[PDB]
Design a protein around this ligand. Sequence first.
Ligand code: 5Y8
Lengths: 267, 342
Amino acid sequence: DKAMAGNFWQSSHYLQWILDKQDLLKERQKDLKFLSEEEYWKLQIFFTNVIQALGEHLKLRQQVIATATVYFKRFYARYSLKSIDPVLMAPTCVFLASKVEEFGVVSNTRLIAAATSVLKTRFSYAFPKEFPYRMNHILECEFYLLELMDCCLIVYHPYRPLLQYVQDMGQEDMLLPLAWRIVNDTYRTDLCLLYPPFMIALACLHVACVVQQKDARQWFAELSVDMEKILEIIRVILKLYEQWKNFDERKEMATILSKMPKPKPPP
Amino acid sequence: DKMDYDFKVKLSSERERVEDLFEYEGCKVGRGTYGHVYKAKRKDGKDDKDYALKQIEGTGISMSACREIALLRELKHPNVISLQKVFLSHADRKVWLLFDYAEHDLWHIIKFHRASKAVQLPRGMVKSLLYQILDGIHYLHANWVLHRDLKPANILVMGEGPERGRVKIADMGFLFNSPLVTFWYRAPELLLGARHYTKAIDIWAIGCIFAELLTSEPIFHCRQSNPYHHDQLDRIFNVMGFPADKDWEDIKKMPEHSTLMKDFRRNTYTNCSLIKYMEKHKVKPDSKAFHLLQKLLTMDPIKRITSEQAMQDPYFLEDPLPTSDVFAGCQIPYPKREFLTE
Ligand SMILES: Cn1ncc2cc(-c3cnc(N)c(Cl)c3N3CCC4(CCNC4=O)CC3)ccc21
């Protein structure tokens, strides 16, 4: 029973941050001069995992993590990886998301300790040196994040619709756990910038149904939804896992992070 | 230092500073816990309109400011105040907000009548004011957004302009939704130690305001840390009467109930009822107004009516019907906002 729970069609998410794929690719050309298309999605997957592991350390519910991941996606959707260090942007997004969702102001010392500890423990393969930023950087970077997003803080995720579909299906025991992970996995892709969250929900449920061999064609057929757009999301989710299979993160990412464009310093 | 330089300088060059867009020097209309509020006018732009420009207190993006920005950005309804633009002053790290300026509010309007020669609030104006207050709060509640501090000073009315006499609910501030000197608009469950705000708590405040519009004085007026406040409850009971077992069955479930029984005796308020209070301020107890007021001022929160149902009350189908312009095209006697300096 969260705030703004059924306002999506007049919301800032829908009326601004559901982007055109052409425009998304066009601004991405600026970072594609250094990194290949393959190396760019491999970078998306990595910072999705960094933001995840920052959430699990700070003891944060999946929804507050999901927003942090979206903020991050929105920023670099419109700007280069040189603009602000994504190692700084990640903990700023988690810090900012926690304030918005009313989970307390995650403490300064605890926020810095989280980033420091996660990068040393679970990400040493990519980051050999310590987390170099102190809290006054997080506070500065926050001001840029809130500015780019046009102060759009409320963000709608697929989980709430997924619940409503699995309840309606009458199969919450079998499907909801697997469906919920596929929804988590959609954040490795662009899908949340390109399609509305209920459609992302519907795709994950369909893949959940296919994996578990649960026939649901009739149930899906009864929806008044554009199924071609659902098949688009399924194809991305199906690709996502083939990307997963062939992507060894821990061997590759150290090299990819050096290829990222460098921020130009003051003269 | 570690960011891209071209990126910093571009945004620095392109960022709209507040100082440069608006003339507010020596036009401070309000100063409170919220921060600083000015009556501004656009400098460069060919805009003749008046703006309320608020500087939020404290450096940075506080919990209190973050949610305020969050909700206001999504919220869009005629009777709730619309956020035009947010300015983020990077140097001092202050946050400014820009609203369409509301000249008047119920606090200042009520104060104007209460002052008097020794001219009470016109009845059609009150109905229109009430209807609009219930229209906005219903929009907030439909979106699972609670006010948590409805009072006359937060119910703004617009001055001479396109939106003449339109109500505008202001103030979207407020730890786990848990509240643990003026408690006149506070519901009794909060006084008896309710651990969470509800839609019902706001509806009580609307009744207290509606009461105040009719009588020109606060229904639960009382002298001045913990949730339990004796003298406020004493005032509520002296007006409303002490709640019988059948009126509020789950009062026993309140944390301060055992404290209430120690300190209060129900026999003391046997000659007390809302019918009697309102009668003493020349309000007929068999009037559609009174009956709505009573439904709004139900002691038991689960027996208090929703804003949805309040708008549906036949009070609003009785002559005079509520108007969009609360003044109904009548010359506005209420004085304008006096300026400040600090
Ligand atoms: C001295 N005094 N007393 C009430 C009051 C209200 C305003 C005011 C005028 N126009 C508009 N458009 C807004 Cl939004 C206003 N405010 C109402 C919300 C406030 C207060 C609480 N928290 C807030 O943010 C700011 C002032 C200005 C001076 C006033």
